[PDB]
Write a protein that binds this ligand. Structure first.
Ligand code: KSG
Lengths: 88, 73, 119, 101
RNA sequence: GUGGGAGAGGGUGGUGGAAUUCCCGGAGUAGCGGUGAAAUGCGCAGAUACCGGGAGGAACGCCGAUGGCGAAGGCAGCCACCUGGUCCACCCGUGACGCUGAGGCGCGAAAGCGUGGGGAGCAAACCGGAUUAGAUACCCGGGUAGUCCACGCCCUAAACGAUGCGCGCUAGGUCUCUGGGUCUCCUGGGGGCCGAAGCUAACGCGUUAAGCGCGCCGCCUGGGGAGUACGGCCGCAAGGC
């Protein structure tokens, strides 16, 4: 599982500033985190379809905020993706 | 009527999750391995449900039975 | 021709015939009776009477082996199980204890049509 | 790592030696998987509700270890290897949920 | 985001006890089994009933609800690991980042198809028993596929609340599951029944709306002929759309 530490780090890591626990980029990060872990969990248990829905959802939720990130500020988008290695 | 008494009422405080207090769980069993129904246990929706697993756990650890022959009939 | 005195008597009820078996204080049957052992040829074997007889009969043969005490065991439900018990009670052997051990699956084999349609 | 409770039940006809022999293997094999003991309780002989492995009694070993979860499913395999060890059951330590209090 | 919680939500490995069948040994007879009656069958190579031992598959009583969870199909022995959804509290962070959703992609009960494995019980087909005017049934005894596992395919259904998703508004009473509080009661989410206004062809619906409204998709436009024909697409096939 994801551990507070493992988590908070990711936060602090992206947080647009001190105390920020919500900035899109944060959000996006954390997601991506879960996503990946999930994905991982799906590289096996390939028959755990249910979880994958969740995944699918996350993937979606993620790609939403992003599309919003651009619209509002293109830079913070490029900057973010690149830093998360999203796309592919 | 099932108005004999509730195993709970005629008992002290006990951790429902301690799958070893065989001197207590024992109470929650019928004159057979069987698990007394809420009407008896006296427990609650959440309780009875826990006391449920525990009596299963202990069963495995050869502590509590799964069934006891009936005496009379 | 063995002398047993104390022993166990199994009672096996059914909707098609009741059958008794008397064993040594450890499961090894001494004498055994059913409804068929008696006269009755079919449906009849069910009845508490058919059962009763079936009981006394086996209580009888048992005596000859000195049988005196018996612990009652009963498996199943059916046409006159009770009569059998009451039969053995007054049959003459002293009734130590009556006890039911009827088999009940904690859900194993799919019963056959004839018995399905429940849950 | 998570806090657990290793329940072990083995043959009740083991002479003083044999017993402490198994006990060792346990105490040992445990270490192998990170098993850091926090305490134990020895109840030993207790009549079983039912006969386990023909024998109507069992010796009881209860450990409240603390180890790497990704290896808990193994810690048991090993314990289960003991021909005297007739029962193994590890549980996650859960605060006691009281009742009738 | 922080902190609490409940659950048969999913996946993998593991593992307990009951019962059935089979095998072995012990002991023991003459029947057992089955039905409305019966017969087919099983038994003196000794069945049944009984004790002990062993093997194997399937399922997992009681708890279990009038309950819970899931988007649906669906999910309950116990244990652990891996994982989805969710509610409540704090009101902390972002700042409208939202709803719907043609086609697509994914999931999708039962049966059924391919290869392999498995095979206790059940049991289409089929084999006998009986019933009857007959009985290619209903009842009885067997019995193959199959039903269980793996990978793959099929993808339909009274796949039903027969009631698309999302948001706001409109008396309450009571039962219940679950979270928070100053916890004989207030407060949040869920499941039921009764029921205001209102709706309804009526039955019924009724803050779990079939009410008052907004957005967005799906679908209907007489019965039979037909879910047929033609065509296209899919499918190993059965077939499906
Ligand atoms: C003997 C009868 O068996 C069947 O009828 C049975 C009826 O006669 C009674 O025994 C009960 O109601 C049963 O439940 C019925 O099944 C049915 N097969 C008709 C038969 N009639 C005769 N055999 C006759 O009249 O002679």
């Amino acid at each position: 599982p994801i551990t507070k530490e493992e988590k908070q780090k990711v936060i602090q890591e992206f947080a647009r500033f001190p105390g920020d626990t919500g900035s899109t980029e944060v959000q996006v990060a954390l997601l991506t985190l879960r996503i990946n872990r999930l994905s991982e969990h799906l590289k096996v248990h390939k028959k755990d379809h249910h979880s994958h829905r969740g995944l699918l959802m996350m993937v979606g939720q993620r790609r939403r905020l992003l599309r919003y990130l651009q619209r509002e500020d293109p830079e913070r988008y490029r900057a973010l993706i690149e830093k998360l290695g999203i796309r592919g | 009527p099932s108005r004999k008494a509730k195993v709970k009422a005629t008992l002290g405080e006990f951790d429902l999750r301690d799958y070893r207090n065989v001197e207590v769980l024992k109470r929650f069993l019928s004159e057979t391995g069987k698990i007394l129904p809420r009407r008896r246990t006296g427990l609650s929706g959440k309780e009875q449900r826990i006391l449920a697993k525990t009596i299963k756990r202990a069963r495995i650890l050869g502590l509590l039975p799964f069934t006891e022959k009936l005496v009379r009939k | 021709k063995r002398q047993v005195a104390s022993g166990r008597a199994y009672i096996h009820a059914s909707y098609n015939n009741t059958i008794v078996t008397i064993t040594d204080p450890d499961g090894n049957p001494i004498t055994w009776s059913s409804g068929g052992v008696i006269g009755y040829k079919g449906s009849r074997k069910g009845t508490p009477y058919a059962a009763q007889l079936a009981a006394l009969d086996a209580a009888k043969k048992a005596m000859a082996y000195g049988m005196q005490s018996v612990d009652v065991i009963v498996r199943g439900t059916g046409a006159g199980r009770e009569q059998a018990i009451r039969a053995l009670q007054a049959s003459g052997l002293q009734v130590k204890s009556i006890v039911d051990d009827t088999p009940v699956p904690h859900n194993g084999c799919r019963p056959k049509k004839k018995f399905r349609k429940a849950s | 790592m998570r806090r657990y409770e290793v329940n072990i039940v083995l043959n009740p006809n083991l002479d003083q030696s044999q017993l402490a022999l198994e006990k060792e293997i346990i105490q040992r094999a445990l270490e192998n998987y990170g098993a850091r003991v926090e305490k134990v309780e020895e109840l030993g002989l207790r009549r079983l509700a039912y006969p386990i492995a023909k024998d109507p009694q069992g010796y009881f070993l209860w450990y409240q270890v603390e180890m790497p979860e990704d290896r808990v499913n193994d810690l048991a395999r090993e314990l289960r290897i003991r021909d005297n060890v007739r029962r193994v059951m590890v549980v996650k330590s859960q605060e006691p949920f009281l009742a009738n209090a």
